[PDB]
């Protein structure tokens, strides 16, 4: 169809005209504005882990014997390496 001649070719100079207005980056258009103001980097891992490791254990050493039955750790599973003979090997 021919009829779209006078139309939407205005849009080509209208849409692409808005989009023309759109793109801007001089003068740092984030002002920002105001204001002021790796080896070590050895305490960042320390402020990370070494603060808790202290705090968490201070809640344990002072603790495990406080609770009547706290952490339940299991038996040694003794093997005939202490008081025993084998005696086989059979």
């Amino acid at each position: 169809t021919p009829e779209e001649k006078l139309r939407l070719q205005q849009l080509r100079e209208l849409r692409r005209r808005w989009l023309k207005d759109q793109e801007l980056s001089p003068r740092e258009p984030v002002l920002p504005p105001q204001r002021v103001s790796t080896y070590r980097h050895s305490i960042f891992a320390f402020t990370h882990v070494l603060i808790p490791v202290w705090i968490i254990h201070y809640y344990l050493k002072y603790h495990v014997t406080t609770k009547p039955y706290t952490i339940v750790e299991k038996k040694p599973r003794i093997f005939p390496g202490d008081t025993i003979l084998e005696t086989g090997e059979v």
Binding site: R7, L11, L14, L24, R27, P29, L31
Partner: protein
């Protein structure tokens, strides 16, 4: 839809569901003319019932042989990652509520916006009233005179003319 162009909507999709069936890129290509042969077998004859059997029996042999999970052209009426990006969607007219110190940024851009409005500030007196002249009573599809006879500003301004982009 006018009886003339009714085969197009089939002629568009006919080969479409084909390619998702074929695998090799030549396979689609090799069957092109071969299956293209069937169209012009009767090239020039009646528009009415005589050739309506080119429409009539086109129903079967198409729907039969349909749904081999077609290739969907991802950004489109359906299929994956089509409408995907809404996390922007460009809510045009976000420029209202600010409390400046948020308006320090893009000063050149705030300058440009208020310059667009002057068109839409007053384009109306002949923009709206011409639509009272243009459409006599019950007019079908509603666009103005394509120019609006001197300068359209936009006229469709700005909702369709400034509308939202994709990224």
């Amino acid at each position: 839809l006018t009886h003339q162009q009714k085969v197009l909507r089939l002629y568009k999709r006919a080969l479409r569901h084909l390619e998702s069936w074929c695998i090799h890129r030549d396979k689609y290509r090799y069957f092109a003319c071969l299956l293209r042969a069937r169209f012009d077998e009767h090239k020039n004859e009646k528009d009415m019932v005589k050739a309506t059997q080119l429409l009539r029996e086109a129903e079967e042999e198409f729907w039969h042989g349909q749904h081999p999970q077609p290739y969907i052209f991802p950004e489109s009426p359906g299929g994956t990652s089509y409408e995907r990006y809404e996390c922007y969607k460009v809510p045009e007219w976000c420029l209202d509520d600010w409390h400046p110190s948020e308006k320090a940024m893009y000063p050149d851009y705030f300058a440009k916006r208020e310059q667009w409005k002057k068109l839409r500030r007053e384009s109306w007196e002949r923009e709206v009233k011409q639509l009272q002249e243009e459409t006599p009573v019950g007019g079908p599809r509603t666009e103005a005179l394509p120019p609006a006879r001197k300068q359209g500003d936009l006229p469709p301004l700005w909702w369709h003319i400034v509308t939202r982009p994709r990224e």
